[PDB]
Design a protein around this ligand. Structure first.
Ligand SMILES: C=C1/C(=C\C=C2/CCC[C@]3(C)[C@@H]([C@H](C)OCCC(C)(C)O)CC[C@@H]23)C[C@@H](O)C[C@@H]1O
Length: 254
């Protein structure tokens, strides 16, 4: 049960990641009014035909996700070591992790009060029924909500949250990476920072096997990523879908 202190480098890594997150995640959601507006058609019956015909929530949620990818790119660039990677590996890591980091960072707006992502007034409160109105199905949405609740209940320190996002991005087991060894070295530096932080700074009982629980959430995210990809592919078969997306979203998920 040794509890080595955080090294000066580890303290700097945490400070950098906290600063990067504070610069790239606006907790007031003040830009969301600039997105194409949310529209909610009457769909109490959960009609797939209606949902695909209208895709009423897709422009807004696509803009939200596009915006969020831009922010994740900015965050990633500040991760210590990320800029030591080749441009090619950086782009592979960003494209493969984008939806996973979006799912992680969204936990900050997720609330167990009513199981929504609450980002302002009623207009920017996103519920499961809004995600079906963007052309996704419960095979993704239901495990996504379970994931959000499981993550929320870890009661992560912001330090742990930003480390987890950085570890998710800098993953040596993404398809198409060149220098897996360098990526693994960067990830290990982050992982060791997180393990050390938890042992130092996270009091019981919330610290109990917390690192293992966090690593399991990274595995859960792979499953969610795969399902999202399959559903995105099917969504994209809808005529005129591309106009409801953005160029960045089309690249990242196409
Ligand atoms: C983004 C963020 C937010 C919510 C994320 C949500 C709720 C709506 C439904 C989303 C966007 C999920 C669905 C599955 O994403 C669909 C994306 C497309 C339509 C491109 O397939 C994934 C994350 C979900 C809001 C805020 O926390 C910022 C964060 O980056």
């Amino acid at each position: 049960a040794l509890r080595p202190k955080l090294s000066e480098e580890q303290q700097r890594i945490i400070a950098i990641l906290l600063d990067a997150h504070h610069k790239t995640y606006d907790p007031t959601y003040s830009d969301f009014c600039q997105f194409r507006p949310p529209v909610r058609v009457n769909d109490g019956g959960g009609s797939v035909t209606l949902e695909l015909s209208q895709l009423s929530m897709l422009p807004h949620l696509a803009d939200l996700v596009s915006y969020s990818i831009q922010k994740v790119i900015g965050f990633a660039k500040m991760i210590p070591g990320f800029r030591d990677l080749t441009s090619e590996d950086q782009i592979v890591l960003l494209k493969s992790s984008a939806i996973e980091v979006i799912m992680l960072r969204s936990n900050e707006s997720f609330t167990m009060d009513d199981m929504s992502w609450t980002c302002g007034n009623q207009d920017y409160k996103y519920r499961v029924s809004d995600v079906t109105k963007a052309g996704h199905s419960l095979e993704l949405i239901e495990p996504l909500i379970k994931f959000q609740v499981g993550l929320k209940k870890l009661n992560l320190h912001e330090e742990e949250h930003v480390l987890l996002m950085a570890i998710c991005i800098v993953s040596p087991d993404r398809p198409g990476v060149q220098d897996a060894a360098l990526i693994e070295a960067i990830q290990d530096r982050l992982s060791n920072t997180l393990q050390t932080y938890i042992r130092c700074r996270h009091p019981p009982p919330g610290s109990h096997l917390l690192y293992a629980k966090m690593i399991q959430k990274l595995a859960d995210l792979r499953s969610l990523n795969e399902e999202h990809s399959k559903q995105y592919r099917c969504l994209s078969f809808q005529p005129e879908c591309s106009m409801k997306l953005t160029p960045l979203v089309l690249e990242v998920f196409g």
